[PDB]
Each structure stands twice: as structure tokens, then as C-alpha cells.
Amino acid sequence: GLSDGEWQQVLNVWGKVEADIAGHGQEVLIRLFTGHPETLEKFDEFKHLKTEAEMKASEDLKEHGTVVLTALGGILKKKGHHEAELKPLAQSHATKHKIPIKYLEFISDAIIHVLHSKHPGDFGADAQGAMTKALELFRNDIAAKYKELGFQG
Ligand code: HEM
């Protein structure tokens, strides 16, 4: 878990994302999809968008990026008290979408990349530490539910 000073840093960095969640969201998905093409195949609506310029030209992708980051924002503001919010997500991603925990690792790394790409020199070493912890926590609680369900990979 995190200290309160650590949570205040992640909510301070999240205020930068909130200035434009769709712009941040589309960059995160693109990072993900271009870096790990196997992840795009899980998306029936977007698997035909194989290159960055195709991805960029779809408002449907940008809206999906908005759904993702708005969900995550909600969870971060719970400061770790997020069992009611994470359970549904865990369930759907394991039993419906069949998303291995490794893809959650990929998106967590994608977020960090995009914060440094969109705010160079503005994402401090301390901020990076706190954000990393918050994403690990998120991932580790989802891993716990995955084990319960025996979602093997
Ligand atoms: C920060 C991590 C993520 C969050 C907050 C998130 C959130 C969401 C939400 C809120 C939905 C809609 C409701 C649902 O079906 O639960 C959804 C759907 C979905 N997610 Fe995620 N997700 C995340 C990561 C991922 C990753 C890493 C993948 C795959 C590589 C993935 C694949 C999907 C798919 C395929 C759908 C259904 C798509 C559709 O409606 O067209 N998710 N996700």
C-alpha cells in the first residue's frame, strides 16, 4: 500500500490527465497496441487498425480510451479502498475478455511512458515512484481475483 503523501502525489499527477482525458487515453492505447500487437486482437472493433496512423483516425478508439482512463481515475481516488470497483473489472477481464495479467502489466508501463511523453520534465522522480506503486497495487489486487477464478495466465 501507499502512504498518504504518496497518494497525494498520484492525485496531483492525475489532475494533468484530467485536463484532457481523451488525448491521454488515445496515446495510452496506441502505445499499447503498437508495442504489443497481440493486444489489439482482443478488440473486435479495432483489430483492423493495425498502424498508428489508422488508430489515430478513429473516434471510436478515442472514446474507448476515455472509458478506460475514467474508470481508472475513479479507482485511484479510492486510495486503495477499491474492492467494490475492482471486483467487476477483474471478473469481466478474466471471464469475458480473457485478458492475461501480463497485458495489465503492458498498459501500466504504457501509462508511465505517456506521462513522460506528454509532460517531459514535468513528471518527477517522486511522482513516478508514487504512480508506479499505485498501478502495482491495482494489478496485484486484480491478480488476487484472477487466482481465485483460476485464470491460469
Ligand atoms: C487500466 C486497465 C483497464 C481498465 C481500467 C479497463 C476498463 C475497461 C472497461 C470499464 C470496460 C467496459 C466494461 C467491461 O467490459 O468491464 C472494458 C472493456 C474491455 N477491455 Fe478493458 N480495461 C483495462 C485494461 C484492458 C487491457 C490491458 C485489455 C486488453 C489487452 C482490455 C481489453 C478490453 C476489452 C476487449 C474490452 C471490451 C471491449 C468493447 O466493448 O469493445 N482491457 N475495459
Which among 129, 98, 125 has a CA at the least distance from the CA of 7? Answer: 129
Grid cell listed for 15: 489532475
The residue range of the domain holding 6 is: 1-153
- DSSP character at residue 123: S
User: For the domain that residue 124 is a member of, what is the CATH number?
Assistant: 1.10.490.10
Instruction: Write the DSSP assignment of 95-115 as a string of letters.
Output: IIS---HHHHHHHHHHHHHHH
Nominal resolution (angstroms): 1.6
**Residue 151 corresponds to which amino acid?**
F
Q: How far apart are CA 83 and CA 142, in angstroms?
A: 10
Q: Is the Cβ atom of 36 under 6 angstroms away from ligand 1?
A: no
Q: How was this entry determined?
A: X-ray
Q: Ligand 1 mean position to 42 CA, how many Å?
A: 10
Contacts of 43 (CB under 8 A, 6+ apart): 64
Closest ligand 1 atom, CA of 88?
16
Task: Provide the domain count of the chain.
Answer: 1
Q: Ligand 1 mean position to 149 CA, how many Å?
A: 18
Grid cell listed for 92: 469481466
